[PDB]
Design a protein around this motif. Structure first.
Motif, PDB file in Angstrom:
ATOM      1  N   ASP A 798       0.846  -1.184   0.000  1.00 16.16           N
ATOM      2  CA  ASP A 798       0.000   0.000   0.000  1.00 16.16           C
ATOM      3  C   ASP A 798       0.883   1.236   0.000  1.00 16.16           C
ATOM      4  O   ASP A 798       1.822   1.329   0.795  1.00 16.16           O
ATOM      5  CB  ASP A 798      -0.931   0.014   1.213  1.00 16.16           C
ATOM      6  CG  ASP A 798      -2.175   0.838   0.983  1.00 16.16           C
ATOM      7  OD1 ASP A 798      -2.055   1.965   0.461  1.00 16.16           O
ATOM      8  OD2 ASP A 798      -3.275   0.360   1.326  1.00 16.16           O
ATOM      9  N   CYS A 799       0.587   2.177  -0.891  1.00 11.98           N
ATOM     10  CA  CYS A 799       1.312   3.437  -0.951  1.00 11.98           C
ATOM     11  C   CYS A 799       0.679   4.523  -0.095  1.00 11.98           C
ATOM     12  O   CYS A 799       1.250   5.611   0.022  1.00 11.98           O
ATOM     13  CB  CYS A 799       1.413   3.921  -2.399  1.00 11.98           C
ATOM     14  SG  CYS A 799      -0.166   4.285  -3.168  1.00 11.98           S
ATOM     15  N   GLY A 800      -0.475   4.254   0.507  1.00 11.32           N
ATOM     16  CA  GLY A 800      -1.126   5.220   1.367  1.00 11.32           C
ATOM     17  C   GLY A 800      -1.585   6.475   0.658  1.00 11.32           C
ATOM     18  O   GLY A 800      -1.350   7.584   1.146  1.00 11.32           O
ATOM     19  N   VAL A 867     -12.248   3.788  -7.531  1.00  6.25           N
ATOM     20  CA  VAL A 867     -11.314   2.684  -7.343  1.00  6.25           C
ATOM     21  C   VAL A 867      -9.885   3.185  -7.479  1.00  6.25           C
ATOM     22  O   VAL A 867      -9.620   4.197  -8.131  1.00  6.25           O
ATOM     23  CB  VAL A 867     -11.575   1.538  -8.341  1.00  6.25           C
ATOM     24  CG1 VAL A 867     -12.928   0.912  -8.093  1.00  6.25           C
ATOM     25  CG2 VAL A 867     -11.487   2.057  -9.755  1.00  6.25           C
ATOM     26  N   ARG A 868      -8.959   2.463  -6.856  1.00  8.01           N
ATOM     27  CA  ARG A 868      -7.547   2.800  -6.972  1.00  8.01           C
ATOM     28  C   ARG A 868      -7.028   2.423  -8.353  1.00  8.01           C
ATOM     29  O   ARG A 868      -7.440   1.419  -8.937  1.00  8.01           O
ATOM     30  CB  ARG A 868      -6.737   2.086  -5.892  1.00  8.01           C
ATOM     31  CG  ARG A 868      -7.206   2.365  -4.481  1.00  8.01           C
ATOM     32  CD  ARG A 868      -6.342   1.665  -3.450  1.00  8.01           C
ATOM     33  NE  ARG A 868      -5.090   2.369  -3.218  1.00  8.01           N
ATOM     34  CZ  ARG A 868      -4.335   2.217  -2.139  1.00  8.01           C
ATOM     35  NH1 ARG A 868      -4.677   1.389  -1.169  1.00  8.01           N
ATOM     36  NH2 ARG A 868      -3.209   2.914  -2.032  1.00  8.01           N
ATOM     37  N   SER A 869      -6.112   3.234  -8.875  1.00  7.82           N
ATOM     38  CA  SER A 869      -5.569   3.029 -10.207  1.00  7.82           C
ATOM     39  C   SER A 869      -4.055   3.161 -10.179  1.00  7.82           C
ATOM     40  O   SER A 869      -3.486   3.828  -9.313  1.00  7.82           O
ATOM     41  CB  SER A 869      -6.158   4.026 -11.207  1.00  7.82           C
ATOM     42  OG  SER A 869      -5.497   3.948 -12.455  1.00  7.82           O
ATOM     43  N   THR A 872      -2.748   6.776 -10.598  1.00  9.48           N
ATOM     44  CA  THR A 872      -2.821   7.615  -9.412  1.00  9.48           C
ATOM     45  C   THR A 872      -1.984   7.090  -8.253  1.00  9.48           C
ATOM     46  O   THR A 872      -2.065   7.640  -7.150  1.00  9.48           O
ATOM     47  CB  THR A 872      -4.275   7.763  -8.966  1.00  9.48           C
ATOM     48  OG1 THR A 872      -4.695   6.565  -8.305  1.00  9.48           O
ATOM     49  CG2 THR A 872      -5.169   8.012 -10.162  1.00  9.48           C
ATOM     50  N   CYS A 873      -1.194   6.044  -8.468  1.00  8.54           N
ATOM     51  CA  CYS A 873      -0.366   5.495  -7.405  1.00  8.54           C
ATOM     52  C   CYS A 873       0.727   6.481  -7.011  1.00  8.54           C
ATOM     53  O   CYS A 873       1.257   7.214  -7.849  1.00  8.54           O
ATOM     54  CB  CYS A 873       0.252   4.171  -7.847  1.00  8.54           C
ATOM     55  SG  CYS A 873       1.129   3.281  -6.558  1.00  8.54           S
ATOM     56  N   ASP A 874       1.064   6.494  -5.724  1.00  9.20           N
ATOM     57  CA  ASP A 874       2.027   7.437  -5.174  1.00  9.20           C
ATOM     58  C   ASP A 874       3.391   6.812  -4.909  1.00  9.20           C
ATOM     59  O   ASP A 874       4.233   7.444  -4.265  1.00  9.20           O
ATOM     60  CB  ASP A 874       1.478   8.049  -3.885  1.00  9.20           C
ATOM     61  CG  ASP A 874       2.035   9.428  -3.612  1.00  9.20           C
ATOM     62  OD1 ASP A 874       1.653  10.377  -4.326  1.00  9.20           O
ATOM     63  OD2 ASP A 874       2.857   9.563  -2.681  1.00  9.20           O
ATOM     64  N   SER A 875       3.630   5.594  -5.384  1.00 10.76           N
ATOM     65  CA  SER A 875       4.897   4.928  -5.126  1.00 10.76           C
ATOM     66  C   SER A 875       6.038   5.645  -5.834  1.00 10.76           C
ATOM     67  O   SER A 875       5.893   6.117  -6.963  1.00 10.76           O
ATOM     68  CB  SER A 875       4.833   3.471  -5.577  1.00 10.76           C
ATOM     69  OG  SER A 875       3.890   2.747  -4.812  1.00 10.76           O
ATOM     70  N   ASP A 876       7.183   5.730  -5.152  1.00 11.33           N
ATOM     71  CA  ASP A 876       8.338   6.405  -5.730  1.00 11.33           C
ATOM     72  C   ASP A 876       8.851   5.670  -6.960  1.00 11.33           C
ATOM     73  O   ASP A 876       9.178   6.295  -7.975  1.00 11.33           O
ATOM     74  CB  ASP A 876       9.444   6.539  -4.684  1.00 11.33           C
ATOM     75  CG  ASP A 876       9.072   7.488  -3.561  1.00 11.33           C
ATOM     76  OD1 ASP A 876       8.110   8.265  -3.731  1.00 11.33           O
ATOM     77  OD2 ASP A 876       9.743   7.457  -2.508  1.00 11.33           O
ATOM     78  N   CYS A 879       4.773   0.417  -8.767  1.00  9.54           N
ATOM     79  CA  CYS A 879       3.427   0.558  -8.237  1.00  9.54           C
ATOM     80  C   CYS A 879       3.264  -0.355  -7.031  1.00  9.54           C
ATOM     81  O   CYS A 879       4.141  -1.159  -6.710  1.00  9.54           O
ATOM     82  CB  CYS A 879       2.369   0.240  -9.305  1.00  9.54           C
ATOM     83  SG  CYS A 879       2.049  -1.514  -9.562  1.00  9.54           S
ATOM     84  N   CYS A 880       2.132  -0.218  -6.352  1.00  6.50           N
ATOM     85  CA  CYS A 880       1.813  -1.045  -5.200  1.00  6.50           C
ATOM     86  C   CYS A 880       0.663  -1.985  -5.535  1.00  6.50           C
ATOM     87  O   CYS A 880      -0.033  -1.827  -6.540  1.00  6.50           O
ATOM     88  CB  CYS A 880       1.467  -0.184  -3.981  1.00  6.50           C
ATOM     89  SG  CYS A 880      -0.120   0.651  -4.059  1.00  6.50           S
ATOM     90  N   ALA A 881       0.474  -2.977  -4.665  1.00  4.31           N
ATOM     91  CA  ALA A 881      -0.479  -4.043  -4.947  1.00  4.31           C
ATOM     92  C   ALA A 881      -1.916  -3.535  -4.950  1.00  4.31           C
ATOM     93  O   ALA A 881      -2.721  -3.951  -5.788  1.00  4.31           O
ATOM     94  CB  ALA A 881      -0.314  -5.172  -3.933  1.00  4.31           C
ATOM     95  N   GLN A 882      -2.261  -2.649  -4.015  1.00  4.56           N
ATOM     96  CA  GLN A 882      -3.646  -2.201  -3.914  1.00  4.56           C
ATOM     97  C   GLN A 882      -4.042  -1.334  -5.102  1.00  4.56           C
ATOM     98  O   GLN A 882      -5.161  -1.450  -5.614  1.00  4.56           O
ATOM     99  CB  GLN A 882      -3.865  -1.455  -2.600  1.00  4.56           C
ATOM    100  CG  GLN A 882      -3.368  -2.197  -1.375  1.00  4.56           C
ATOM    101  CD  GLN A 882      -4.390  -3.153  -0.803  1.00  4.56           C
ATOM    102  OE1 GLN A 882      -5.065  -3.872  -1.534  1.00  4.56           O
ATOM    103  NE2 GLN A 882      -4.511  -3.165   0.518  1.00  4.56           N
ATOM    104  N   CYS A 883      -3.146  -0.457  -5.554  1.00  3.09           N
ATOM    105  CA  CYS A 883      -3.448   0.364  -6.718  1.00  3.09           C
ATOM    106  C   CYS A 883      -3.538  -0.454  -7.997  1.00  3.09           C
ATOM    107  O   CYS A 883      -4.136   0.008  -8.972  1.00  3.09           O
ATOM    108  CB  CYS A 883      -2.401   1.465  -6.879  1.00  3.09           C
ATOM    109  SG  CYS A 883      -2.604   2.854  -5.754  1.00  3.09           S
ATOM    110  N   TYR A 884      -2.961  -1.652  -8.019  1.00  6.53           N
ATOM    111  CA  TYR A 884      -3.072  -2.524  -9.181  1.00  6.53           C
ATOM    112  C   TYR A 884      -4.292  -3.432  -9.074  1.00  6.53           C
ATOM    113  O   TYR A 884      -5.143  -3.447  -9.967  1.00  6.53           O
ATOM    114  CB  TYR A 884      -1.793  -3.349  -9.348  1.00  6.53           C
ATOM    115  CG  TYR A 884      -1.749  -4.136 -10.632  1.00  6.53           C
ATOM    116  CD1 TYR A 884      -1.431  -3.523 -11.832  1.00  6.53           C
ATOM    117  CD2 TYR A 884      -2.029  -5.490 -10.646  1.00  6.53           C
ATOM    118  CE1 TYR A 884      -1.392  -4.235 -13.003  1.00  6.53           C
ATOM    119  CE2 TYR A 884      -1.994  -6.208 -11.811  1.00  6.53           C
ATOM    120  CZ  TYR A 884      -1.674  -5.578 -12.987  1.00  6.53           C
ATOM    121  OH  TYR A 884      -1.638  -6.299 -14.155  1.00  6.53           O
TER     122      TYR A 884
HETATM  123 ZN   LIG Z   1      -0.441   2.782  -4.917  1.00  4.58          ZN
END
Ligand SMILES: [Zn+2]
Ligand SMILES: [Mg+2]
Ligand SMILES: [Zn+2]
Lengths: 1202, 69
Positions: A798-800, A867-869, A872-876, A879-884
């Motif tokens: 999760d990228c929060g 929904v998460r996309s 829009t993920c905030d990972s540096d 990507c993270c699992a939840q946004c995928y």
């Molecule tokens: Zn994310």
RNA sequence: AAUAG
DNA sequence: ATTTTACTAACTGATAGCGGAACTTTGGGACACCCACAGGTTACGCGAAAATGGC
DNA sequence: GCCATTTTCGCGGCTATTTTTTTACTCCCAAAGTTCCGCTATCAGTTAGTAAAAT
């Protein structure tokens, strides 16, 4: 061992440090003894001995003298592989400009020295002088003097000034530059500048200058004084059979350079006239340019074969270069290839492998087991036993391959299902036996296909083959999540034939105790497969919560349906089998087995389905014959009527009633209607038959015609192909595309005449050529996508982030194109799903939407969700699992380390070959556009509102009248600008007309602050704007196709993401291709990776600078932690090619394309590659930072942190 | 291998743990905790993981015990 | 170049 | 008394060195007068970016 | 000095399996370095013989 790769310019001292000696003669080898000549291109004193632990003398000729340099020869006693590593050098008599830093546009020397390239070449080509030290004179540095003017001012001033000509002049100009002073000057001039063109020029030059200052490089290193020489074993001169020698072209180029250098030295020693010396210096420059990059300066130097010589740039670059031919792909050991046949007895995890092929592939393993069990004393004895093919060798081979998985591959490998792991079963023969159910994954048919086979050696590779690549693991399509092992052709046909229903069959009305007694009745010829009976069925149902309910009851069915129920796993309803089973029905059976029972049950069920289908397709006796093509009797009457009415229309044309175009159009419509009628009559005649029932009456039954059964079951054939067999071929097209008036009024049963066949060939050739060319187009597109997305890996959980995308059913008219359930299946909720008209949280945040929650959403009539996309993920990084969300090939949430970018690129690229107001519902009307909402609250009609029966909120009843595929995808992913783009409102404000300046018009807008913004519009523009109107930002002023860049600038990231996704999905859905939108979103995320800084702030960023977004975000977080002004940026949308070329790593960018530009820019900048993506680690031989290697890399990132 | 991925959770982690266990049974002298049944070390390790006998923490604990001894 | 998928 | 073995001296082959003549190899020279070159080519097409031109 | 038009630059699918190419041209001489055959001479290894020892 190493953590990064560093690139930069090479100093003369560095080139001398690399060198083990100086090459002084163009000699290579003696013509009699074939030994290297001293101080030549192959000198053993410079590059090393020609035999291991020997000298050319023959005096020191063993390992006892290792490291000792012979005094007679000078050859070090060491190994011969050192000739692949030891370099040499040439001391050039005159400086030579480097061709890459001179002609690879833009020119770095010209940019640094602020002089045009033409002037630089004029100085280099000895046509014009240039001032190096102006002295106490009006002359300025860099000002050009002709020979006449130079002589004049030499008489005028004398030794006060220095003026030179050639590469020495450019070196002196570059050496005398004060870089910090220039940087300060450009900064000061940028402070007080207004023109954007000059701003661009100074910002580019300032970037170059400060890069030079930071890197430690010196500009004069762009002019060569010492030339490195490649190791001889990389440019070999090797003997062929018959005394012939094969050589590399680099030897010719080096010999030319050395000869011209020696001639220059001799001319300078002889004190030659200046014209000859200038000529020799020009030739030395030309020779060095040819050695480095042949053909860039001018006419490419050719050898005796009349073809251009291959230079070092050609060594490293291109499709046939080192990056792509030898580094991104290789030839491998422990591999084989053979033709593939079908094994219908195999299991889904098994493949039939030939015995001889296995013997060759698994040879070291056989040697090891022969030595272990004492059958062979040494390895040579084992080799002899294997060569003699003893029986014990075959037993050892069986024991070796007992549980060793093997990898099967078929080219082209369009997606990851093109490589799968199987357990080998040794078979007598020379052909590989392939399981039928995997053929669709491989796109493999048995008409001459060949497959390659690879043997994983280490334990990790074997476990990867068993766990990840095994065929039983990959039964879902990673592109869509749909099953990929669905039965086809004979299987389906068999399952279709066994489950059909016949009226008054033998054994009708019989009562059966169960499936076993149905089988007994079938085997005893008591009842037919198609007899309608009543069977006692025990059915177990596994509910969503896991409840297992068993009910026994008597069901009306057929014998075949119960016999098929015999193999259905427990936990499924009998309704899935109590029908005729086409391809869709069997697909549904397998899907329900997977969704409700798991993986093992699905695999066993698939195997049993394929066995049963094959057996009963064999038992059916389905055959094709000439009497199966039933031509309707209405075809001839319809043809006659069409011909007569065409004659009438021709008569009307001769009377002038209608024009030629009208005649053409109505003749075409006549023939199209005739074709439709003939097809309908043929289908009606072929689909039904009349039978005598038990009562003796006549009843209508669905036909058992073989062609009808093949088409209806979905095994092979469609309505159009049966049309062509038994109806009309129809209207055909000319090569340009126009339709021929007279159609082919014959089918393939009757046979065409010569003209009809010629017309048919017109279109057949076009189809074949189109396929052939689109193959290459699709391949290039897929490669570009894989390059742009290769770095995307699931790096976190999760990228929060609270951001997300808004998801709604796709409405393109009066019907839903796709449901919200299909869009939401597998996506993580970003904002709580409140029940409409209520505040109850039906679905909380951060929950994966599976089938159960999809049914929950569908039941409660929810229209719009969030929904998460990935966009829009905030990972540096990554990507993270939840946004995928869900991994479509596995059914659960995506795991850390999954290379989702490669999966996305393959998913998009694989189907490229297939690529080329009255209300209708009841509800209320809402205006935003026009929306017709049902009573349940779902939006079911979305309609345009051009600038009405019912107003806002007024209920409307039904019927009330309220009142180019593959190029398109390539253009969408390249962010191409349309030819005539729509003009959009730059700013929100009141429109105002303007002064119609000649040529093209101007308009103005007054903003909320009263500021006037002027817009420039072409004359031929149907403006939709009216004065005194406050047009919102992004509103269309002139209609036309919308540029994605304008959408991003004026509407945002979400708008451009939706635009690209919708257009790509429109192209794919026109052809019936199912691809999830998260793949397109991943590609779009890789498209939105750069930002141009608008406010410099205090961070180390210049205005108008295109930099990576992640770097800006990290810097802004640090500055906010320090409580200081953050940077302001505008995000940029780049095409996949430009985004790929503008990555941080220069290894990947060089490996993609434009190697010379990438390497030149990296060298002048002094870039450092941290090897963070997949391609870099593939090239350097390390584990990729994805999947099984992911954790490994993480550990290293810890150790560097500590 | 559904049981193994259920007991571990991640396929890559399962591959790594099974590789360590298989190397212990092949290169090292460690014996199997389940009936071998004429199976290769990889399949034995997968069966042990499915039975719950072998996990990453268990392997680390046994390595620590060996280091202590 | 030609051929097979 | 006889048989096996250890010691020693002589033969022979490999090998480093040398002689010397044949053999390969390198550098110089040639004096009617001669005085500016090729040299095949190309029926691509498309998009970007970089260099020129227009007023 | 910016807006448009012309000019380079780089690109155009993956695996297999069959098979080399081809014009163009001085001679002589003196001086120098290298090679190839033959002979020598020394050292080390091998082998034959005989005395020393043991059965
Ligand atoms: Zn994310
Ligand atoms: Mg085929
Ligand atoms: Zn030597």
């Amino acid at each position: 061992e190493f953590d990064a790769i560093k690139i930069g310019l090479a100093s003369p001292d560095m080139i001398r440090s690399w060198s083990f000696g100086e090459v002084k003669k163009p000699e290579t080898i003696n013509y009699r003894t074939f030994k290297p000549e001293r101080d030549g291109l192959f000198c053993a004193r410079i590059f090393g001995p020609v035999k291991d632990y020997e000298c050319l003398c023959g005096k020191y000729k063993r390992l006892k003298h290792r490291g000792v340099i012979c005094e007679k020869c000078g050859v070090e006693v060491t190994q011969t592989k050192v000739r692949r590593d030891r370099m040499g050098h040439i001391e050039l008599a005159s400086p030579v400009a480097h061709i890459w830093f001179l002609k690879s546009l833009p020119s770095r020397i010209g940019l640094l020295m602020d002089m045009p390239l033409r002037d630089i070449e004029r100085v280099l080509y000895f046509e014009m002088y240039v001032v190096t030290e102006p002295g106490m004179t009006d002359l300025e540095r860099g000002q050009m003097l002709t020979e006449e003017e130079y002589l004049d001012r030499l008489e005028e001033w004398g030794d006060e000034f220095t003026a030179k000509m050639g590469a020495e002049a450019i070196k002196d100009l570059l050496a005398s530059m004060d870089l910090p002073a220039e940087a300060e000057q450009m900064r000061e001039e940028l402070d007080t500048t207004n023109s954007e063109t000059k701003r661009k020029k100074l910002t580019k030059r300032l970037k170059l200058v400060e890069a030079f200052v930071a890197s430690g490089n010196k500009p004069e290193w762009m002019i060569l004084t010492v030339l490195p020489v490649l190791p001889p074993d990389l440019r070999p001169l090797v003997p062929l059979d018959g005394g012939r020698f094969a050589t590399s072209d680099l030897n010719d180029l080096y010999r030319r350079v050395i000869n011209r250098n020696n001639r220059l030295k001799r001319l300078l020693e002889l004190a030659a006239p200046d014209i000859i010396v200038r000529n020799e210096k020009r030739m030395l420059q030309e020779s060095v340019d040819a050695l480095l990059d042949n053909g860039r300066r001018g006419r490419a130097i050719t050898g005796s074969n009349k073809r251009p010589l291959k230079s070092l740039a050609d060594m490293i670059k291109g499709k046939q270069g080192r990056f792509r031919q030898n580094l991104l792909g290789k030839r491998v050991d422990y591999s084989g290839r053979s033709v593939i046949t079908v094994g219908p007895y195999l299991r889904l995890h098994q493949c039939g492998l030939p015995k001889k092929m296995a013997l060759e592939l698994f040879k070291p393993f056989i040697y090891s087991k022969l030595e272990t069990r004492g059958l062979a004393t040494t390895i040579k004895a084992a080799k002899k036993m294997v060569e003699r093919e003893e029986a014990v060798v075959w037993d050892i081979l069986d024991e070796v391959i007992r549980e060793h998985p093997v990898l099967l591959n078929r080219a082209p490998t369009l997606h990851r299902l093109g490589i799968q792991a199987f357990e080998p079963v040794l078979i007598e023969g020379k052909a590989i036996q392939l399981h039928p159910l995997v053929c669709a994954a491989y796109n493999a048919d048995f008409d001459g296909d060949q497959m390659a086979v690879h043997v994983p050696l280490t334990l990790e590779a074997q476990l990867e083959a068993r766990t990840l690549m095994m065929s039983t693991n990959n039964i879902l399509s990673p592109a869509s999540g749909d099953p990929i092992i669905v039965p086809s052709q004979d299987v389906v046909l068999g399952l279709y034939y066994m489950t059909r229903e016949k009226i008054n069959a033998k054994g009708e009305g019989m009562y059966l105790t169960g499936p076993a007694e149905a089988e007994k009745a079938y085997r005893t010829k008591t009842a037919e497969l198609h007899a309608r009976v009543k069977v006692r069925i025990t059915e177990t149902i596994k509910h969503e919560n896991g409840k297992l309910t068993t009910e026994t009851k008597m069901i009306d069915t057929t014998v075949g349906r119960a016999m098929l129920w015999q193999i259905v796993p427990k936990g499924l309803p009998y309704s899935l089998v109590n029908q005729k089973l086409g391809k869709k029905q069997i697909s549904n059976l397998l899907n329900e087995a997977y969704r409700k029972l798991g993986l093992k049950d699905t695999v066993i069920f698939a195997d049993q389905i394929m066995y049963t289908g094959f057996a009963y397709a064999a038992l059916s006796g389905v055959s094709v014959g000439i009497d199966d093509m039933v031509v309707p009797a209405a075809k001839y009457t319809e043809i006659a009527e069409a011909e007569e009415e065409v004659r009438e229309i021709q008569e009307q044309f001769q009377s002038g009633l209608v024009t030629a175009g009208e005649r053409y159009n109505k003749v075409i419509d006549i023939w199209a209607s005739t074709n439709d009628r003939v097809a309908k009559a043929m289908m009606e005649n072929l689909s039904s038959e009349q039978v005598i029932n038990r009562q003796g009456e006549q009843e209508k039954q669905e036909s058992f015609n073989s062609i009808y059964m093949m088409a209806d079951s979905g095994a092979r054939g469609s309505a159009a192909q049966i049309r062509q067999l038994a109806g009309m071929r129809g209207l055909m097209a000319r090569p340009d595309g126009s339709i021929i008036e007279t159609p082919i009024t014959a089918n393939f049963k009757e046979g065409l005449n010569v003209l009809q066949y010629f017309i048919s060939t017109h279109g057949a050739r076009k189809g074949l050529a189109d396929t052939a060319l689109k193959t290459a187009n699709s391949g290039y597109l897929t490669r570009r996508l894989v390059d742009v997305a290769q770095d995307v890996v699931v790096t976190e959980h999760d990228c929060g982030t609270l951001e997300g995308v808004v998801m709604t059913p796709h409405i393109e008219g009066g019907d839903v194109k796709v449901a919200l359930t299909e869009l939401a299946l597998g996506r993580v909720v970003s904002e709580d799903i409140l029940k409409p008209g209520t505040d109850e949280v039906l679905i909380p945040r951060n929950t994966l939407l599976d089938e159960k929650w999809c049914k929950v959403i569908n039941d409660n009539s929810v229209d719009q969700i969030k929904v998460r996309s990935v966009v829009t993920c905030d990972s540096d990084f990554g990507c993270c699992a939840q946004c995928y969300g869900r991994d479509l090939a596995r059914g659960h949430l995506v795991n850390q380390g999954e290379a989702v970018g490669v999966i996305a690129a393959q998913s998009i690229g694989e189907p490229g070959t297939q690529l080329t107001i009255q209300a209708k519902n009841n509800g209320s009307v809402k205006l935003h556009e026009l929306t017709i909402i049902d009573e349940f609250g779902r939006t079911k009609e979305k309609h345009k509102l051009p600038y009405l029966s019912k107003a806002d909120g007024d209920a409307v009843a039904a019927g009330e009248t309220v009142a180019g595929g593959l190029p398109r995808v390539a253009d969408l992913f390249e962010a191409r600008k349309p030819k005539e783009p729509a003009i959009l409102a730059e700013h929100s404000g009141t429109v105002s007309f303007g002064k119609e300046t000649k040529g093209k018009r101007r308009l103005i807008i007054t903003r909320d602050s009263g500021d006037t913004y002027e817009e420039m519009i072409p004359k031929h523009r149907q403006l939709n704007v009216f004065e005194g109107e406050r047009i919102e930002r992004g509103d269309v002023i002139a209609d036309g196709p919308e540029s994605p860049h304008d959408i991003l600038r004026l509407r945002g990231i979400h708008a451009v993401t939706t635009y690209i996704a919708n257009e790509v999905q429109e192209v794919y859905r026109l052809q019936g291709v199912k691809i999830n939108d998260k793949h397109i979103e991943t590609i779009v995320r890789q498209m939105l990776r750069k930002c141009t800084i608008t406010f410099a702030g205090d961070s180390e960023f210049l205005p108008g600078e295109t930099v990576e977004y992640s770097q800006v975000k990290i810097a802004n977080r640090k500055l906010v932690e320090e409580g200081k002004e953050p940077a302001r940026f505008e995000r940029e949308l780049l095409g996949i090619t430009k985004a790929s070329l503008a990555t941080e790593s220069f290894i990947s960018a060089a490996s993609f394309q434009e190697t010379t530009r990438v390497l030149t820019e990296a060298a002048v900048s002094g870039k450092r590659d941290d090897l963070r993506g997949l391609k870099e680690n593939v090239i350097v031989g390390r584990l990729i930072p994805a999947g099984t290697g992911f954790a490994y890399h993480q550990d290293r990132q810890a150790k560097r942190a500590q | 291998v559904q049981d193994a991925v259920e007991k571990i959770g991640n396929r890559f982690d399962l591959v790594l743990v099974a590789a360590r266990r298989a190397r212990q049974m092949q290169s090292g002298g460690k014996d199997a905790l389940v009936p071998e049944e004429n199976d290769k070390p990889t399949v034995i390790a997968l069966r042990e993981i499915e039975e719950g006998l072998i996990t990453k923490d268990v392997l680390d604990a046994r390595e620590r015990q060996e280091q202590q001894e």
